[PDB]
Design a protein around this ligand. Structure first.
Ligand SMILES: *Cc1c(COP(=O)(O)O)cnc(C)c1O
Ligand SMILES: *Cc1c(COP(=O)(O)O)cnc(C)c1O
Lengths: 385, 385
């Protein structure tokens, strides 16, 4: 007759969160202004004010992406969810998709592609793709879309994109780019680089809480989407509905799903923040911090996974795991003795490296100092064969 | 040579949000404790502390759902996203899905079902489904899964579920229930009612910000999922990955996607809140407010769309639009002159009704007072043929 479950004891306690300095590939710490944004009251998801904040975020995405694409908006999901929305609306079953698979991300792009109806232009962690090699790929399969990771956060590789725009439009192919870890930390120009679909996450250099993602479509990728004959497998990610709600259409905004309002307040303020600083300074800040961090690490004796500075993702550095060390001890030592988070590999780079992230408000010399003296400490106290 | 887009002027201004009393079908206003949760700093998405908060939320979902299902967790998306995750992992292409389509929600369930590979047991806004009629449906198509809306927020209909558990297990059919608008506001017992998949939203009676959703699978629906031969079209919604991250497996938590950490802090506190109050009181609060509100409205002259109190969703009441009135004026009048939000129809009920929502901390006599004197005012000042 009764209620099977009783109120959980743990919930009857107060929520208590540790203070951790997030210096890994994401999420990153939140500036005071973003936290304040997080604690505001709620407004109607379809109110005139919500739309206004929505338009500002759009102008915000056009600026950080550097595009004028009308089809620009926020995906109410994390990084993956933006990738998936990209693929599920552009790729129609059996389409030939060439994938720059040199990190867990390309790996993820294949999986999604397979699942929805693919050519694994494979590499090894640490490698990138030459303008040369992609023609070779565009050659055989003449795919309708190519996938490239700008900032490969699982390997630390910064991937060059100048020209590819054309090398793809050449073969009547759409260019899809992942700038989840690169946005705000290295130069990127969607239009001038002829990228067709660009997506990014909110919790990396932008310092917004995780859960939302940014996306933009060129008139080219747009036309393919509005004239496919199949309806994309997903309703939650349907750009036709999505675009209309975000005001990208000629029609009145129609109810699709309830946007994550509080997260939008936060994303808006994080876009305001980089708009006040300016992309060029943010680019200079990250480059400088990444340079400082590289110096210190080599001084500690560790060597950089990515041999060649031009190919090093400023926002995420991949150090090679030291000699007779179990990386796990190092990571544990740092979070245990200094309250600092840093990671190990991910996918192909698993156990081969340590990843140190420098993002937005955390990409400072001060934190490079802290993670250096943390790492050094680990190095002298952690077991060693 | 330059940057095409310049920092948006609007973003250079401070974020300013109006104070609105949200009394429509969602989202709802946030108690002080949830807002505080929203403004906390970030922690690692895979830290031991994040997992602890994750387990508490799980215990939290088992309690509000009233189940012990190990396969219980949060979907990093809104209500739809939980429905979609439900359907995309249970239904395999060409499966026969019987859908209680009596509101925009069944409508949504068909669309998703079609998109992924369906029997529209149609009704009219205001109607519900008799234990009788579903056998008739389970009869013809002998579908592997049935979809039922517990709280139809677009029509105001509270749908009875006692027995259906069996009337479905009878025909070897899985029972899928939508308790996005009913959870916390009317009695629901997942196990005792033999529901197989139950999902709810975070922004309705729970008073958490929108963007996350709750889901639970019975051992039955679980087995079908872990032994389908096709991989679900979605990677972001793959329960195999999802379950593992949420600690429902025998394996170490493996990185899938970055959970919306800040939103989880808030959802945890909103679960703590109802755990302190108790489901039975929350059920009593909403029933009582809905009763008070019904009285007042009929006193104002308006009539209730749903004729029969037993079928009236406490959390969302559907009033019929009055005589020579343009509903739009009424809704505008209320948000314009009293800062209060209430809605009109949605889908099948479009323009036929007004929807007044009573949710969680907003389901009070005080707010019933406010929306009554708001509505009355509208009634005397808005145009009338
Ligand atoms: C972190 C990261 C992702 C994943 O974003 P999520 O929000 O965790 O799904 C995707 N791509 C790149 C390059 C990343 O660094
Ligand atoms: C509001 C509502 C939904 C939609 O939830 P979203 O988070 O806006 O996608 C689904 N079902 C019911 C019964 C609802 O009331």
């Amino acid at each position: 007759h009764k209620l099977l479950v009783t109120p959980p004891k743990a919930l009857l306690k107060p929520l208590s969160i540790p203070n951790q300095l997030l210096l890994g590939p994401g999420p990153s710490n939140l500036p005071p202004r973003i936290m304040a944004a997080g604690g505001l009251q709620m407004i109607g998801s379809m109110s005139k004010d919500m739309y206004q904040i929505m338009d500002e975020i759009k102008e915000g995405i056009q600026y950080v992406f550097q595009t004028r694409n009308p089809l620009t908006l926020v995906i109410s999901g994390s990084g993956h969810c933006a990738l998936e929305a990209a693929l599920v609306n552009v790729l129609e079953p059996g389409d030939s998709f060439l994938v720059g698979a040199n990190g867990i991300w390309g790996q993820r792009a294949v999986d999604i592609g397979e699942r929805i109806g693919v050519h694994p232009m494979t590499k090894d962690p640490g490698g990138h793709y030459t303008l040369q090699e992609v023609e070779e790929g565009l050659a055989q399969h003449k795919p309708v879309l190519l996938f490239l990771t700008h900032g490969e956060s699982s390997t630390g590789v910064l991937q060059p994109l100048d020209g590819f725009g054309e090398l793809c439009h050449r073969y009547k192919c759409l260019l899809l780019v992942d700038s989840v870890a690169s946005l705000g930390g290295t130069p990127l120009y969607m239009d001038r680089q002829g990228i067709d679909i660009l997506y990014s996450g909110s919790q990396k250099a932008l310092n917004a809480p995780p859960g939302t993602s940014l996306i933009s479509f060129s008139d080219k990728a747009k036309k393919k989407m509005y004239s496919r004959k199949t309806k994309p497998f997903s309703f939650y990610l349907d750009i036709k509905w999505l675009a209309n709600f975000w005001g990208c259409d000629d029609q009145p905004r129609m109810y699709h799903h309830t946007i994550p309002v509080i997260s939008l307040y936060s994303l808006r303020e994080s876009l305001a923040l980089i708009a006040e600083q300016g992309l060029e300074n943010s680019w200079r800040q990250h480059r400088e911090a990444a340079a400082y961090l590289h110096g210190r690490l080599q001084a500690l004796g560790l060597q950089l996974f990515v041999k060649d500075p031009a190919l090093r993702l400023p926002t995420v550095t991949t150090v090679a795991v030291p000699a007779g060390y179990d990386w796990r001890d190092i990571v544990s030592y740092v979070i245990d003795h200094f309250d600092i988070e840093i990671m190990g590999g991910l996918g192909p780079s698993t156990g081969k490296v340590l990843r140190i992230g420098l993002l937005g408000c955390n990409a400072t010399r001060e934190n490079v100092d802290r993670v250096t003296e943390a790492l050094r400490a680990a190095l002298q106290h952690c077991p060693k064969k």
